[PDB]
């Protein structure tokens, strides 16, 4: 659920998911269209696509449990939806950390009309 992904973001990047990642580029937070504008925006694209492969699960509200062995994210057993929602979120957070160095403030509150084109998952 969003409660875990956000805590996971915060743990990983240091930044609060809202506002840092709730309205970035074209795909972080409202994804529907356009070309992702950068690494961080591509993470959100792959993340939206990850949720997309689970049409019968509920990413935002279904809670899963995870632990850290040292720095590592390890998804605990749950229902199959929960394990797979957890895997998509783990990916996004790693992806966010690996591209912190290019995170740009100019892509915060990015306007919608500047997001043009379908890109396929």
């Amino acid at each position: 659920s969003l409660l875990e992904f956000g805590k996971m973001i915060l743990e990983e990047t240091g930044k609060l998911a809202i506002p840092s990642y709730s309205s970035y580029g074209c795909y972080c937070g409202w994804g529907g269209k356009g070309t992702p504008k950068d690494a961080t925006d591509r993470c959100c694209f792959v993340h939206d696509c990850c949720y997309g492969n689970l049409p019968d699960c509920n990413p935002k509200s279904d809670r899963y449990k995870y632990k850290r062995v040292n720095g590592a994210i390890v998804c605990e057993k749950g229902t199959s939806c929960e394990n797979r929602i957890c895997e998509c979120d783990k990916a996004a957070a790693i992806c966010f950390r690996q591209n912190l160095n290019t995170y740009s403030k100019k892509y915060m509150l990015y306007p919608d009309f500047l997001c043009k084109g379908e890109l396929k998952c």
């Binding site: 992904f5 973001i9 709730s22 972080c28 935002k60």
Partner: peptide, 4 residues
């Protein structure tokens, strides 16, 4: 706290 996050996202859509």
């Amino acid at each position: 706290v996050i996202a859509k």
